[model samples]
Target chain A: TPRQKMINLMYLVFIAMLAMNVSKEVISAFGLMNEKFEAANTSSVTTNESLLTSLDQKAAEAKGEFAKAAETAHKVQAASKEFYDYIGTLKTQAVKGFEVDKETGKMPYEAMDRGDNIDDWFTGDGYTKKGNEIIAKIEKYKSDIKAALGTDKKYAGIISEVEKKFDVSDVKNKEGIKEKYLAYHFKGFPAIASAAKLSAWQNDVKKTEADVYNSALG
Target chain B: LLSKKVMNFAYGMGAAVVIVGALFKITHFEIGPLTGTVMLSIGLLTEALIFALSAFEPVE
Candidate 1:
């Protein structure tokens, strides 16, 4: 990836070099990653949902911890759905063509293809109330998971990783001014690129739901 | 169009800019505990340029 680093900076230095020809290629690369993430998100959802149901299913089977696991899975899904819905709302507000859902939050595939709203909503001077809420929900999801799982030794690490993923660390911009993490990543990013990343994180949430339940069932 | 080589040079230049950035972020004729933290991305950007220019080039 250092090589890619080379190209990104090279574009800035040698305008003649960053060449317009392969702009398609750059988008293509992002598109490829997006496609993979799309699949990963779907796959995790299917598996996670299936696990959630199986935790409560059987002819009359898989009782006790498995049944309780299903109930906790519902709680996890509820929290996750809340986060998912909020992400949709952000995308929805932006999608209004600058104008204006639940069930994965109804963000259009197209909505995620642009960066302006993504940046405006999530970064700059500070987290907008909407933005802060986004951070809050990310933390809420982790807290909810902990509350459900309760005193489990391994739960701590997963919470940390989730926090790192949604981190608000400030990065120094070109003039060396500190900027929020979302602005740093999406200021000029394509819509799908950010969308794909968030979707992937959503996958992690569902996958986490499944993991917690499976561990309980174990 | 002298364009191909020019493109490579641009990519290289961009690569250098961030690499220098990586250096500034990492070493300062001195050290810091998390000194190299920012280099992770500078490194990635540099690689992205390399890949974009070389292996990931578009079809003619």
Candidate 2:
């Protein structure tokens, strides 16, 4: 009975850790959005029409990278939310199964006596099977988001190249609207920050899940 | 009245300004702690205002 109480306490701690980690991730996402806003305001561009046209092409490429990043973040967020919800359901079932007393319970075996379909409780069966399916989906989304993030990082170099080509002093001239427009165009897109933040958050979640699941099984 | 395409373009440009400004600070520019906080607060407030204003606009 004391051992059971201790295990319950540990489980509570684990749940608290999971909640804390998730909240951190959400805050980090917002922080990335904040950073993106800062970048967009201070960018600069060239005045020559041909040069401006070239800058436009580069800006489009950067925008494309950001778009891909945002799309991937959305996918990851959806799948992760679903996975977390399913895990919550599984946790409820697990707690219920663990609570049953053998003498007064339906089955003689401790694991079997608790919930519906005791034979395949922890294995790849019943509710657990469904939960694993959700986990698989989340993993797929996580992989895609990582791939998108890699592409976004490449765009960072492209942005730097564009910055190098521009005449920074000309940006402040009264007649520098074309340059300013080009500079401002590619600066601070939320998609970039969102992608970076989501990438970090996804890694943290992956680690947390491994920690909790391994501890639970052991 | 502006067409839907024009309106969308305007919003996109606005989003670009805010988002790009944020990115500039995060990447190329560095600021003092107090200044950075103030800038971020303003940017966030502007984003909220934009979102709210967009919500009240008549549907095209």
Candidate 3:
């Protein structure tokens, strides 16, 4: 009961802090997550591109495992592209209807301190069709990639995480409590943070795509 | 917005910083009695608050 009481008190502190934060501060806070996603997008896009490109080079010159691997890599990319694009579309939707900033030419979330529409869109009823679609997309990505990577012994070790890392199952927080994935990620978050969350998943797609490529090449 | 998890961490960290910082000073350096008393008092208060804060650890 002491623990429950503490938990209750902590929730109170959380609610209090939520109100205490200034509107601009809430929007600005998501700036960190947004930057992280953009960085991930850049890094993974570059890495996946270079891997496939080099594989293509090897295939053009030597016609060996490299050629086979390069072909496989393209297949892997094709599979991941669907999930990646789906996430990208969601990211666009997250910022739908926001004005562009004059300096950055991006959503003026930081300037306007908006969260209502984004929160409502993402934080819709947990069982909403769109939310389930996102989860289904993740599942589809996993199965599709697994099928693409079929029987590749070299990368067998990572096969489980191919789905596990991007999983929507209830997961344990740092406090060792199992929390719902959808609610934990999408619910009540601002547009910037939601976009960043989606972008983070895109990185996962890219990372796995690269891994599939790397596994094939070697 | 800061989540419950982050608040837990912030409070946990605040408690640790004050407690450890004071502990380090008291143990590692020569200090006037007044300064030592004040630092320890702050540390003692921190100890109580952090102990209270820990009760919030959600039960499994």
Candidate 4:
């Protein structure tokens, strides 16, 4: 009995360890993509700040035409800042339970194969509170920006561009079932990958702000 | 002596089945409804049964 019991126990442990293992190469690939997006996020933020500064300076000197332009720029900046920061919080939440490597000062990407943390936070039966909040904020940003620019024909292209970037509509899966935007894209993705995706969204925020400021200046 | 020979044959057959299934799992080979995972489990349990039976063999 003891001999059989010992062998069975060992087999159980082996199965447990096997279940814990996952694709490390895939995890590290997500880490690489995340690092790239993080770098680009910083660059675009700096560039957008400079663009906003330039528009404000021009708006001050030539108030006749640039007056309303500066006003729109400030509105876009305000909305973009709120939405951008909200996404930053979500990114922080995604990486909450994970530890950064002491040597590299980077997230432990290989250990981030499980998506349970993000799955619980951002996904639910239909849409969780956080999921709906994300959609609401995107919709708010779009409406706020469009309202700031008014119905000017010159800004129509910019409006369409912003809409495309922040689209939160339902997506159809390969199985042809309608899925919520958050569930379709962010659910079941690894923590690092989802954080990377959020960084990409922040890049879009910066890009949209830059575009609006530039068009306002012109 | 005949029973001993049958037991040895069972042990050898069980070992062969488990090894072949392990190889199939490593190579991700599938056969209709029987996947490598299923094959491996079946093989391992077969070996387990053989081991349990052999444990009762009369000691020398």
Among the numbered candidates, top DockQ falls to: 1
- Whole-structure CA lDDT of model 2: 0.40
Better of 1 and 2 by lDDT: 1
Ranking by TM-score: 4, 3, 1, 2
Top candidate when judged by TM-score against the true structure: 4
- Residue A76's C-alpha lDDT in candidate 2? 41
What is each candidate's DockQ, to 2 decimals?
0.09, 0.01, 0.04, 0.08
Provide the TM-score for each candidate, comma-separated. Answer: 0.56, 0.23, 0.62, 0.70
With a 3 Å backbone cut-off (N, CA, C), the pairs that clash in candidate 4 are none
Error of 3 at A208 (Å): 2.3
Worst 10 residues of 4 chain A by lDDT: A13-22
lDDT of 3 at A124: 44
Encode model 4's per-residue lDDT on B5-53: one tens digit a residue. Answer: 7866765665566656665664455666776677668767977777667
Tens-place lDDT digits, model 1, residues A11-37: 654454222222324555665666677
lDDT winner between candidates 2 and 4 = 4
- What's the best-to-worst order under DockQ? 1, 4, 3, 2
* List of clashing residue pairs for candidate 3: A6-B56, A7-B56
lDDT of 2 by residue, A1-218 (tens): 96999999999999877432223254354444434432321121112223334434454567664444444434444554554455445434433433435675322121221133222332211125643454455455445434543344444443333234322322433433322222232222222232333333333444333322222222
Candidate 3 chain A has its poorest 10 consecutive residues by lDDT at: A13-22
Those runs of model 3 whose alpha carbons end farther than 4 Å from true positions after fitting are A1-29, A109-115, A118-125, A173-179, B1-60
Off by over 4 Å in 1: A1-22, A58-63, A91-114, A154-157, A168-178, B1-60
